[model samples]
Every structure is written in C-alpha cells, then in structure tokens.
Target chain A: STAGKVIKCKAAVLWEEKKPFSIEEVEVAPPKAHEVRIKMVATGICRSDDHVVSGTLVTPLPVIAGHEAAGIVESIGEGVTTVRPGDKVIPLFTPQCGKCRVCKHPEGNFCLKNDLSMPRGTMQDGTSRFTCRGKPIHHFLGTSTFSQYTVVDEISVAKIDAASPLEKVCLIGCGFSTGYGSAVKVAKVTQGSTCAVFGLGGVGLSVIMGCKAAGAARIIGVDINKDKFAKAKEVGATECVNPQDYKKPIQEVLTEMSNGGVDFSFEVIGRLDTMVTALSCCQEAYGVSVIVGVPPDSQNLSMNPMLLLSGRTWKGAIFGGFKSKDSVPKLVADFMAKKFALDPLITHVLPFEKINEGFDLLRSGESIRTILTF
Target chain B: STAGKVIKCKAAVLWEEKKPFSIEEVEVAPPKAHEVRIKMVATGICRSDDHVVSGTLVTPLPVIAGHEAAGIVESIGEGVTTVRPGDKVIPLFTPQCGKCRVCKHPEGNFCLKNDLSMPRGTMQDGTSRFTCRGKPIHHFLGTSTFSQYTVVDEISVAKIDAASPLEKVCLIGCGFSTGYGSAVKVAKVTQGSTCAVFGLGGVGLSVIMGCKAAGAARIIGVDINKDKFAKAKEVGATECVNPQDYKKPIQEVLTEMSNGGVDFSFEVIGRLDTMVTALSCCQEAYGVSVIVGVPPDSQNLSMNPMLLLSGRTWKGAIFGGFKSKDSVPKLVADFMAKKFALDPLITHVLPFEKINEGFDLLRSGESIRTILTF
Candidate 1:
C-alpha cells in the first residue's frame, strides 16, 4: 500500500453561454469506495462537446465539458481491483455497471444504468463531487475530463496499454467508437458489400476505416468539402462523392456507382437533409441506413412510407452500440495493432492551455480531431 | 368426361367513360388450351370495379367490369384437368400459374405471368376473344364475370365446395380473400395479439374475421357509421370506434383503449389520413401496420423516421398477398371448419340486371358486399 495526498488542478470551465472557456484552479476530490482517480493525460474534443459549449446541449453553468479522454490512474479507492495506480486508462461517457442485466448481455450497449445516470451529470450516488468557487459544478457525461483530474466509478475506466500515445487513442474513446460501431455493429457491413458514408468528420472517417476493415468492396465517402477527399482516401475511402457536383439525386449517383445502391449507408452529420440522403442511397432490398449523429431538438427526419415498404431499414445508434467496459479496451488494442488509423485522424496536438485554439481549428473544419495534452 | 357446347351470353360492356353499362349480345368462345369456361351465377361488386367504371383504374375501353365472381364450370379446354365441367368455381383476378418460379415459392403472391396479362386485359397470348357489335371488347381482370358466361385461364379459377352459397362465397374471390390474407398471410397476426382495422367496409370487416380466426384477443374497428358497428361486431370486432367522436389524434384514443397500442393495425380505407393513423397506433418495439388499401396516385403517405427506429414496421399487401391457386382452397376449408365468417358480409343480393344498382349501393356505403346473381 502507498500513501497519497489530495492535490489542486486547473480545469477549463464554461461560465456562461457563448463565452470562451475559463481556466481556473479547482481542488481534486479523493477517490471514494469502488472509484478510481484519473490524471487525464490527453482528451479529444468531440462535436457533442461543441454542443455543450454552444448551449445546444445545455449543461450546468461553470461545468467541465470533455468526455472522450485517455489518462493515467493516480489512485484507487477501497475494493478497486480492476486497475491500480499508474495504470493507463480511457474514461467512458457511458459507464457499464457489470452487475446490471444489460451489462451481462452481449449487445449491452443499451445498459440500463448507463442510460439513466449519464444524462443527469450526477454520479451513481446522485451527487457531484466536482465544485468550484464554493459552488457544486456538474460533471459532463459522468467523466468530465476537460479538467486535469477526474474521479469516476471503477467500471467507467477502461485499462489500456501504456505504450500507446494517449493523444491519438483518446479519440477512440467516443468518436471513433461511435462511427466504427455504426458500421461494424449496427449496420453489420459484410465483406464484399458496398457502403456509403455521409459526413467526413472524425466519426465519418472512422466509419470509412471500419468499412475497409470489414472488407467492403466499395466504400463511397460523401461530404460537401472536396478538400476532405484526400484525407478520406488516406483513411480508407475507396471512392469520394460530392453531392454538389451531381445535379441528379445522390441516390441515383450511388445507384450508378455501386451497380445498384449500397448495402449500407451511414449519416454521421446529424442534419435532417443528410439523413434523408443517407436513407435514399440504400439499396431497394435489405439495405440499412444508420444515423449516428446527434441532431438538434427542433429538427425531425421525414421519409416516405413507400421506401420502408420496399424493404429499406433506418436505425439510430449511440456510442456505436458499444458496451464501454468491454469494447473500449479492444478498440484501443486495435488502434495499437495498426488495424485502425487513429494517427492520421489526430491532426493537431496542443497543451491543455491552448484548448480554445484547438476549438477554433475544429470550428474551421480543418482538423479531424484536436487533442489536448497535459 | 362430359361434353359441352359453346355458350352465347348477354354481357354488360362499357363503350365509353361516364356512359351506363350497355347490355349487349356477345358470343362466348370455347375454352382454349389450359383454359376454362364458367357459367357465371353470382358476382360481387367491388370498389375496384367502380374504379374501372369511373376510369380511375384505366383499362382498354369497351370492357366488362366485374372480376369477383363464383360460378359452375361450363367446360374445360383439352389440356385442363384441375376442374371438370359443372364444378363450382370462383374467378380470381390474379392467377397463380404453377409453372412460374413464384408459384413454387411459399410466399410468392405476385405471379409474374398473371400480373403481366391482367393489366392489358389479355391472356398470356396477348389477345382478347370477347366481342361486342362485332368489335373486340377487352375483358376486365381476365374474368369478365359481368357476362353470363366467361372464359379464363385454368389457373385463374379456384374450385370450391358445392355446399357453400355461391352468392356469398363469391366475395372470397377478391375482397374477402384480400382482407383475410392481409391478416393471416401478409401480416401474420399472432394469437392473443391486439389488432385494429380501419374502415368497416367489406374488406375491413373481413380482416376483422381473419384476425379473430387467427386468435387475436382484441379487434378494434373504426368507421364513421354507427350502423356498421353492429355488423362489424357480429363479424369479429371486439370494439368499435368512430373517427368523428374522439376528435383528438386517432393514435391517442387507440393507445388508451389498447393500454399501450395495438400489436397489429390494418389500413383498408385507401386514404392517406387513415393510413397515417393506422401506422401511428402500432405498439412500440414489434407492432406492424399492414397497408392493404390502394390509394390514388396523387396521395402519398408520409411518416417520421423515428417511428421506424422505435422498432415499428410498415408493410404493403397486394391482393391480400394470396396466391389464389394455393390459398383459395385452404380458405374454403377454413370456412367449412367455422374458422372464418363470410355469410354476414354479404348485405345485398340482386339479379344480374340490377348490377348498376349494386354499384350505387356500394358507393352510398349502404352495403358491405353486393352480389349480382344470374
């Protein structure tokens, strides 16, 4: 056994709507029973984080807003056997309580406990240990890795190999897992099948990698930006399409290129227009279109009944239908194995102090994933 | 083998749209190879027939209208062995040619040959033999049952038990078969499940009976008329709802009645509003809404994509998804076993000369099914 003392840490906090993130000194809480304290080495900025920053997602004021993160375990509370101090780990937005019924199931992405607790921004005990300026601060997505240190339940931290670069692997914690899982799990893109991926963002490019890994015969990457096509190909896109160039419908182009429509299509942009196009590009029989993007509250997707009746299926997937406790480690292993391209996806790395600059790069659509290293 | 001579028949022919059905003397040609001649005894006036008369379902001009009919076989062609002369038979609008690939498959309702020939008002040979004023007049649905004697391909005639009332069972040829098969064949409504049937017309009521026969626990019928409710209940409806009464969204009232929502819902009204209502009232996770009605070309059914993502399914059933040659005989057996109700569905019985009045009654919604007898 080793003795450790509580320390102070700096975190980027959102004080008000449409304001820049503020750097402040905050006290780190000691780990409780069955909990692990993580010193976050690197964190990935996700589109969902942007929603929080823009007030679209609506988090409590002065909250720490990062969820996709990889870190080093600094200390473990009593009864914590999964990981020890100095272990490398990834903090999940969705915590998989292994004792729950859904956790026991193989398709445990829908774990009931993880579903109920994450959105409330409270710990399983219904309280937040996070505080600033003598006021309790909400944890974003249960992890809140925008801070230098985050204390989470043992099940929410996935142990990964220490040799892997924390900056590149952190993106796999959420964005990569979501896009890859959409193709490999939800859509189940089989070998020799054709696929169309809409939106060439971090998640969409990861979908391209997943489709390539699955041995898809044709992987069509669709985005408004023609400049993204080169990176899309580098990430394993077999073909690139710009909807702006085609006067005809996207479905018609997909149908022509794929000999028919693709077997699977994915909408990673989360816009209603893109979602409609994604569904339309699927083949007449047995084609599945998966929506992995989080849309705004006011917009809804509309489609004709004739399309569904003709044997096309549309579905929504969250976190790529992943059970964070089991899948995150394997995804990290795959990242290490060179089976997935995480290095190319991480376009920029900066110190935690330059977080606002990283957000600017993300807003410009120039960087696929910007990692904040501490 | 019995010998029979060619018969001369008096038939109702349409010379132009908006003109009354013309009574004309026509020659009934002898049954050709793989064909049968039937002495039409009773024919049902279907809404499809009205569509043909109003030029909505456009066919070759100067055509005979009725397709749903039951009769005794007058003669058989040289190669015909399925039905003998004087055998009780029902005319099928869509025939199942056993030689086709679809006829061999258990779920093949769309027989290619029958579908190709029926639309053109010609047999597989691409010629119509029916003549009026010494000019070739097209046969409607390849049966032309409005004539005293009619010629049809052997596959288009279903042999029935002589004991069943020809006047009542004639509806089983089209409307009853379509509705019943929509439930049992297409939707496959499970035992002890809940179901809702929109429109308490002949087809909707038959669907109610089919659901009941399939062991559905709750059968909710929707119709504007209060009088139709009694017949709907007698047929099989456990509950009746008036679309005018609830005034709130149809789905809410249906959900309230069903405790959640129905397991299966049928849209038999052929209108977009009722179709939307039928799909919306399906229970979460496993509910399926079967579309059996044929809507006009101008009407398109629209729905939100979230409905499908919730695990609800929408399907279309044509001609009840029944292969007449395979299903009709079994249907008759089921009727004989008291598994289905057919007698009460026939509300009006008129002589052949009163065919126009039968159509009038159908249009007025005063009759569930009207049979014109010779």
Candidate 2:
C-alpha cells in the first residue's frame, strides 16, 4: 500500500509558463497533518488549466496544474475525519472549510482559505508535497490532481458515492458543476423563462442543460463557432446563433431575438467583453446575468454603470456557486440518479500518458471535455 | 374650477442650464386622453432637480423642472380610470404602465413608458402640456411638479392615501422612496446584517433609515462632509466614516472596520468613483451594492469583472423598485400608519415664491430636503 509511504508516480508537470506539460516520474510525499493523500483516478481538462499553460493565469513554475479530478483516498493524516483510505473523493479547487465566514454564509461559497484569489502553490505549512527531478514541484489551486498521488487539505476534498464513475463525475469537480449550479443555484432560472448562454463549450452546454432542466421556455446558445451549435442543441439549446453572423453587437442581436431581452443570460466564456455583452443582453429590469467564466488576472471589466443601474443584476461565483465539500457529493449523487445527463459532456477519454493530446484537443476547440484516466 | 380648461398658475421654470429657477405665471393645459391634471400642493427639491440646474442631467430648455411632488387630481382626461377628481396623488417620474413587460414581471418596476432612458420632454403624443411666455414650455420627466398645475400620463401617476400630508409625503415621491426602497425593496436588505451608505444627502439618510427599518445590525454612513454626520447618526447610522481622514482607499478602511466588508452597500452619491468604492467596500462573496444616484449622462462605470466573479451583486433601480401605481399607495399607507418617520427628512419648508432660496439651501448642503409649498 502507498499509505504512509513515499510513492514514485507519473505526473504531468509544467517546468515553465507557455510550455508543454512533461510526463515525469515524480516522488509524492505522504499527507501531512490535516491533509489527505489522494490517488487520482480521472481528471478533466478545463480551460483554467489551459490558462495556466498559456501564461494567462499565472502560477508557480514547475507546477502540476490540474484542478478537476476524481480520486480515491489512499491515506489520511492526523485529524482527517472527513475521508479515509478507500474513500471515493473529488478534489476541490474551491474548498469549503465549513468554519470560514463564506462557508457559514447562506449565499456565499467562496471560502476564505481558497487559493483562487492569490495562489501560493503550497500546503498550509507553505511547502510542497510534490517533487520532480530532485526539485520541488508546486501545486495549483490547492488541489493539484495532475500528479498521480497528490496530497490535499482535508477541507479541499469531498467524499463522493462509491458507486460513482470517476470519469463522468470528474466533470462535477469544476466545469459541469460551475455551469449547472450557475443556472439552478446562482441565477435560479425561473420556469418558462428565456435564457441566453454565451460560449458553447462543456460549461456552456452544461448551462444549457441546466436551463433545460429548470424548464426554460427558450435556451439560446451563442458562439463564434457554428460547429458548436449542433452539440449545443443536443445539450438543450433551443436555438444557437453565431455572433459573427450579426453586423451589430451580439447583445443588440440577442435583444431583438429574445423580444427585448432574455430573462436570464450567462457568460461562460472567460473574456471580459463577452461578460459585459452577456450582462447587456439580459432584460434591463429584473434580468439576472451570471458570470461563470474566469477572465485573465489583473484585467478590469469596464462598462457604463447604467447597465446595472437599470435594475439588472450582475453577479458571479467559483464552481458555479457550489460549496465544493457540501454540494459536490450531492451533485455526484444526482448524476448517479440520472437527474441530469453527464454523458453528453464527455466527448473524449484518453490515458494519462496522452495528457498533452487532451490539452491540444481543448486548445483547438475540438473537444467538449477530454477526460484523462490514470 | 380649473377642470376641463387651461389654467394659468405660478411655476418655477429653468430656461437654461447653469441658471436659477425663475418664478413665473405659466399656462397649464388640461390633460389630454389617458392623462391626469393635478393641482400641486407641495414639492421637494432633490439633487436630481439640482442636476438639471447644474447642467449635468441634460433635458430640454425652458422646462418646468420637478419630479417629486404630492397633489390633488383636479381633473381627469378621457380614459383616466386609476384616479379621479379630488383624489390625492403622487406623480411618478418612473412610471408603471401596468401593461408593459417589466410591469407584468414579478420583480421589475422600470416601465418601458418611463422617460429616463430617453427624455422627450413631451407626453406620449409628443407635445408639451405647459405654455410660458407665449411659447410651449417642455415638460420634465412627465411630472413637472415645480408648477402649481402639472399634467401627467395616467400611467405616471400614483394615487395615495387621502389623509396623507402633501408637504411631508412629497419626499415619498422621489428622495425618501429612492433611498429607502433601494435598501428594503431593491437590495432586500437582510436583518442583523451590516450596511454602508455612501453620501449623506437626504437620499443617503433615507437609505440609513431603510437599513435601520430592515433591522440591520450596523449601518455605516460615509460622506466627505463631517456636518452631515450628526443628522446621519440621529436618523440611523450606527457610525460614520470620512474618506478624507483615511490615507488608504476608503474600501480598505471599510474592509478593516467591518471585519471583511459590509453585507450591503448603497451609493447615493452620483460620482462614479464612489459607486465603485461602495461596490468594493462590500463583502466579495454575498455583498450587494446598489446605485441610487443618477450619474452624468454618457459616463461609463468601469471596474474589474473579477469583483463580481467573486460573488458580489451589483444592481440598481429607479424609484427603489416600486411599481409606482401599485406600491406607492401602500408606501403612503405605511407612512400613514407611522411605520417610519418622514419628519426628520424635511429640514426646511419654503413658499413656492422662495424656490430659489430653497435651492440655495440645498446647494449650501444646509438642508436635507426643502419642501416648497405652492
């Protein structure tokens, strides 16, 4: 057993920004106090990870950058009561400490201990549990699942149902949950209402699924790629429109298409201008716009305050407003119950050794979600 | 009786921007179809009205300026069914054409028929209802209450309780309602939460009153002027902060004071920077920021979308989200029941002829609200 022992495992580590991930034999350290070591079974390639590789989202060098994953608990350090050896788990990039102000808040899920704001690429003790080529490899977003054997704080892992399929449920760790929860939980899309979803990736399609699940009368999918329209419709988009086809701004076109404006609009694309467009395309009075996309760091979104001043609500969250530890298991259970489909979201599956190919599929927009199995 | 005929009355007219209101005898035409003519009793001098004089909030020249007033419906034109002759009413600058999409929606109150988006200075038929100096004077915001006799579209008028005092409840038409409703109605302020009110004007003070009424645990009043602090504390502010005293940004100071940030923030100041500050001073997870002040036309409010991405809600409304015709009467009834104080907001009362002196009181910041009796 790897429990309480240093394990040599294969991990895709990036030595520098704007570089390809190199599969290397890395030594994984045992879980420290209040930490749990997870043997990652499957990890989903998300845009945020690509952001790191593209140098858009800055993190430490020589880091194992993956946040969306499903795993099994191999060992628990002292005071780790939430999970133990053999427990099925999902790593939470957005953790829920339960005791923090955000965790205790009724509407907030952005935990105070989350690494999204200012990632340090280390454990609570400010040290790495990952080592490659006799040098320390940093962590990403607290839950670095790119490594086969990764250690995370007890609070950063959620125990899922043992019956869960690691590959399908892994999407719940980030993308699916972020988009779905954005509609059902954050925006709380009303029945018979109209919704416009910007972007047609896995998250955007999941948002369409959420809108459909919420009984939306109209779900319009928007993207520059006409190819995405087919999958977008399959995932519950009533109609799909390409912004490139329109002469005026997308918001103006959408406003006319929805008879004034849609009841709810979401920006699943991580670009600031789209976020503003999504906000502007919603009904001026009582329309709610949720931002699910993560824009580049240090970039400001400039807009006329009048956009919000006219009774439009603009809000956003990480992980689709899901409190990872508390909600992920339920989401996994819901997935198992077939409350919603996850199969449509997964377009490709590959071995961990082909991780670079998986990332390439994402970069070229040739895949919705490409899951890499260990 | 001034019914069914053009009536000449004393009125304050703004002939040009950056000029004082000139008192003159103006001819008020009888209401046309679907319109109601009111005999004005009292009106409040609000910052928005001052915006017109300062040339910030641009409108047609030679306009009868005032949107906040209480009056008696002296006559009803053809198809006026909501109110009749002798009915006491408040004119709505933000109308509720009950048939519009926003009016039909559960949470929306910004009627499409309202002139805020594009002020035409005319009725639905595209003609002014007042005549001054033998030339047709432009109407302002449909409810030009600076004149003793003003006509409004039936949709832009709200009938109030008969026993309601005109001089006192006039603030309910605009200032008090905008601020108070921004907290209780628009923000839906929760009990035992912390709130920060920016600007210590009548509207800001009303926001303080609202936070107090909503059972907020702590209300922080922010303003550049120290003189308003005493009145702010007298109304409801638990404490006050002067940004001038802080070396760092006001947001930083607020964050430290609230142990993170307040649960809700209201920007009653029209400045774009303070609006950004108020939004930034709230908790990033669940805090809500509402903009109540009207900014200079065409000016854009710019901020990082990351601020919203962290789960903060940014929204605003005109008339505090009240569907004027439906909610204004209930608000008046609430006032009649002594649910909240209106006296503290009325710092001065002047005769109609001394309207310029009242404006001086407002300009000098020596008055919260100066009511002019017609």
Candidate 3:
C-alpha cells in the first residue's frame, strides 16, 4: 500500500516571494493522522495564487502554492473517515471541522480550521508534507494543488461525484463557487433586482451568472477593458459599461443608470477604489454591496460612516460563504445536473508541466481560467 | 378653524452656533399643502439634536432644534391623507413619502423626501414655517419639535396609539427606536446570539433591551463610565464592562470575554474610535456590527478591509431601519402592550420652559434622556 510510503512527483515550488514557480521534483510524505493523500488530476490558475507570487499576499517561502484543484484520493491517514482511496475529491482552502462555532452556525461558512486570517504555511500540526532538494517545502492555504501528489487534512478535502469531470469541476473549488455563492448565499440577490459587477474576470462573470439564475432584472458589467465585455454579456450581463468613457465617478454613473442605484453591487477586482465605488453605487436604503476580490494586505478601506448610516450593507466572505464540505459536493452535483455551466469560464488548458505558462496567461489577462492536467 | 391662522407660540430657537436656545414667542404658520401642524406634547433631548447645537452637524439657523417628540395634529393641509386633525402623532425626522424608490422597496426605510443628506431647513416647498421677532426661522430635521407648535410635512408625521404616553414614547422618535430596531431589524440579531453594545447610554441600553427581546443568551454592555453599568443591567444587559479598566484594546478584551467574539455588536456612541472598536469585537465568521450612532460628517471610518473580507457583516441605518410612518406606530403599540419599557431611558423630565436646563443635563452626561413637557 502507498499509505506508508513516500511519493516523489513533479510540483511547482515557489522558493521565495515575488518569484515564478519552479516545476521541480519533490518528495510527498504519506498522509499523517486525520489527513489524506491525493494524486492531482487537474488544477486551475487562480488570481489568489498570483497574489502570493506578486508578494502582495504574504506567505512563507519555499512553498507549494496552488489551492484550486480536483484529484482522486490515493490514501487516507489513520482515523480519517470522510474519504478513502479511489474517491474523487476537491481540496478546500476553507475547511469545515463541523465542530467549530462558525461551522455550527447556520449562515457561517468560514470554518475555524481554515488558515485564511493567519497563514500557517503548514498542516494543522505545524509541519510540511512536501520537500524539494532535501529542503522542507511549506504548504499554501492547506491545499497546495500545484503538486502532482499532495497531502491535506481530511477536513480540507471534499469528496465529489464519481462521474464529475475533474478538469472542469476544479474551477468550482474556488473562482466559480466563490462568485456564484457570493450572489446566491452572501447577498441573497432577490428576483427582479438590479445588479452591478465591477470586474469582468471569471469570478465576476460567475456573479453575473448567479444574479441571472436568481432572476436579476438588469445585470450591468463594468470593466476598463472592452475586450472582456463580449464574454461578460455571453454569460449574463444585460449591458457592459466602461468606466473610462464617463467623466463622472463610476458610482454616480451607475446610480444614474439604475435610476437611483443597483439593488446589488459586487467589487470583483481587488482594488480599494472599486470596493468603495461598489459600496457607493448601491441604493442607500436597502442596497447590498459584496466584496469578492482580494485587496492588498497592507491597505485599509476608508469610507464615511454616512454611507452605511443611510442604510447600506457591506460584507465579504471566503469561498462565497459556502461550508466547503457540505456545499462543494452539492455545487458539483448541481453542475452535473446542468444547473450552470463552467465551460464559459475556461479559455485555456495546458499540460501540468506548463504551470508557469498558465500563470503567465493569468498575468497577461488573456485567459479567464487555464486548467492544467497532470 | 386654526387651519388658516398663524398662532403665536413660545418656542426654543438656536440663533447661532454654540449658543443656548432662546425661549421666545415665534409665529407658527399654518400647514401648507401636504403638511401638518402639530401641537407639541413632549420632546426628548437626543445627541443628534446636540450635534447642531455644537455646530458639528451643520444646519441652517436660526433653527427650531428638536426631532424626538410626540404631538397632537392641530391641523392638516390639502392632500394630507395619512394623518388628520387631533391625531396623536410622532414627528419623524426620517419621513416616508410612499412614492419614492426607497419607499417602494420592501426592506427600504429611508424615504426620498428625507433632508438628512442635505438639510433643507424648511418644508418641501423650500420655505420656513416659523418666524421669530419678525425674522424667518429655519426648521431642524423637518420636525422642529423644540417649538411648542411646529409644522411638518404629512410624510414626516406618524399617527400612534391614542393611549400612548407622549413623554415616554417620545424617546421612540429617535434614541429608543434607533437602538432597539437596530438590533431587531437591521442586524436581525438571532436567538441565543451574544451581543456587545458600545456606549451604554439610552440607545445602547435600548439595544440591550432589544437583544434580550430577541432571546440573546448573553448581552455585554461596554462603556467608559461605570455608573451606566447598573442601569444597563437593569435594562437587560447580562453583564457590563468598562473599557477604561482594560489595558488592551476593548475589542480584544470583549473577544476574550465572549470566548471568540460577540455574534452582534452595536456602536451607539457617535465616535469613530468606538465605531471601529464595535466592528472589531464581533465574531469573525458571521458576526454583524451595526453603526447606530452618527459619526462626525468630516471624518471617515477607516479599517483593514480584511476585517470584512473574513465573513463579517458591517451595516447601519437611520431610525433603526424603520419606515418611520409604518413602524413607529407599531413600536408605540408594542410599548403600550408592555413588550418593552422606555422609563429606564428617561432619567429626567422638565417643563418645556426649562429647555436650556435639559440641554445642560445632556451635555454634562448627567441624564440618559431629558423629556421636556409642553
């Protein structure tokens, strides 16, 4: 059995911050107690991974840094019961222990077991499961799917349907789920409502999809790039707008366009200015603005309290407020049932060895999502 | 009929910034089209009213300054259908003109006719209704209940239960309703949730009352003055803590005391520091922080965006998210039904002639509320 042995496999290792991933052969340790080992089938290059590479989102050096992926469980550690060998699964950056306060909460999906607030760069017991050149390689966000074979705690992996396409559903692990659930779960976008999306990225488009699915009357997509508008409208946007075309503040433009303001607004680009604009563009009395993008770590969001005092709600969440273990399988099941399509979000696919090329595509803004098959 | 007559009444008027209100005879004009003239019964000295007195909240003067009051509708103008002559009413600074976008929405309460964003200091027709010493006097918050006889738009007055005590329920016009409804409506504070309320004044205590009414398991009252702790507890606070006693940040102290953090937090003091503190102390995963107090207009509330991105909700509203004309009456009925007590909020009551003394008591922090009877 591979349960008690080490597996040497190719993995994209980031030796330091602001450096490109080096596809190197690394040694993967067997799953420890309450953990699972998996053979990666496919992974998606997400902006969050780029955040770490850009050194904007701080993480430990010499780490395995991809979290959006799907794989088949290779082995299970002692006492692990959720998944077993041969089970199809997706790794979760946000884990659900089920016993924690947040997991027990009805609306909460930010599990206590998650390492989001303070990245440990290791497992729950504070140790690495991968090593390169005999040097320890830290984990990134508990799931590290950049590697061909990786180990994660049982709580951090959700078992999906047997017939699920690993390459397509991998996007569901992060970008797709994050935006879709942001509208459906977080904002609870009501029927006949008006929506404004600030970016035209994969997540932003998915938000439009969610809004459309929820019966939004008008979906206004805002982006500086005119090229992304076609795809944005293809998904669900009623109209696409470029902020550069308007001399007035984008919020004022949106407020004017929507008569008063959009019923729901989402900041999908991780910029402070857009976050404020999204909040400002919503209706004063009952409008809700959601922050779906990750901003720079050091920056503070400053806004007049009068914005909220006039009756607006501002909120954000990880993985679109989905309880990973409980909701990921359901999301996959829904995808399988033809409830929503993931094909529109993926513009490119590459071999696992072309991991750096995938990241480049993301950096160049040429690809919505680039899937890598091992 | 006094419908077409101008009545001379004794009113308290602020002639300039940082000046005491002068109790002088002012000519109260008849209600204009779609307006209602009210004979004041009782009014409360609220912090927001003091904002104008201190010149922090800019408004036109000489203005009749007061909004928190209950009155009798002495006359009604043409097209006034909501309330009629002799109706027991509360003058809403936050009006509900049913035709506006906000008024048409289900959860919206901020009516389009409100002068909060830009104080008009007059009726909808852009004219003042009071003249002092043969000079036109500006209206404050549309209600201007500091005057014994004041004119307000029909949209700004709510007819309440005839059996309601004007002096006690007058607190509902602002402070009590603002705090209580903040918990019950805006935050939608859940059952058995833990709550932390900053600044245990009348509003904060009323928040505690609302939390208790909503079946909160633990209510923590936060205030610098230990003197307020006892009354806070009497009004449903399970425990109270003084921030001055803690060397660490109040958020840290409250977080530790509540195991992780309170499920809901309310900032009832109009201070930027406490607004941030109240937001910081709530549970990270699903806690909600409501900014009930009005911060100074010039300053922005700045905080790390990560605070909200981690699944916490931050929101606020005026009149505690109540549609004034629709909810104030029900609130008075609730008070009459013995659902809650407002007596704990009123520490002093004075004759209408002692308006300056009431303001003095409010400035010295010697009174939770000072209700002035006409």
**Model 2: lDDT of residue B71:** 95
- True-contact fraction per candidate equals 0.17, 0.88, 0.94
Which residues of candidate 1, in runs, are more than 4 Å off? A1-242, A245-247, A255-268, A273-296, A300-304, A308-374, B1-248, B255-266, B283-290, B309-312, B319-374
Q: Residue B89 in candidate 1 has what lDDT?
A: 89
Q: What is the lDDT of residue A142 in candidate 2?
A: 93
Q: Model 3, A1-374: lDDT tens per residue?
A: 25578989899999877777789999898998999999999999889999998887888887899999999999999999999799999999999988999998888999888887888898998988888997999898899999889999998999999999998999999999999999998999989999999989889999999999889999999999898899999999999999999899999999999998989999998999899999999998889999989999899878888989999999988899999999999999999999999999999999988988998887787888889999
DockQ of each: 0.18, 0.85, 0.88
Best model per DockQ: 3
> TM-score for chain A of every candidate model?
0.94, 0.98, 0.98
lDDT of 3 by residue, B1-374 (tens): 25577999899989998888899998888888899899999999988888898877888888999999999989988898888788899999998888998888879888888888888798889998899998999998889899889989988999999888988999999999988889998898878889989988878888898899898999999988888989999999999998778789899999998988999999998899898889989999898999998888679877888888989999988989888888999989999989888989999999999999998987787789899999
lDDT of 1 at B21: 83
lDDT of 1 by residue, B194-218 (tens): 9999989989988998899899999
Clashing pairs in model 3, backbone N/Cα/C closer than 3 A: none
Candidate 1, CAPRI quality class derived from DockQ:
incorrect
Task: Give each model a TM-score.
Answer: 0.69, 0.99, 0.98
For candidate 2, lDDT tens digit of each residue in A1-374? 47587889899999988878999988888888999999899999999999998888878788998999999989999988889799999989987888988999988999999877888888878899888888998899899898788999988999999999998999999989998999998999989999999999989999998898898999999999898999999989999999888789999999998989999999998898999999999999989999989888889877888777789998887888888888999999998888988898899999999999999998888899999999
Per-model C-alpha RMSD: 6.6, 1.2, 1.3
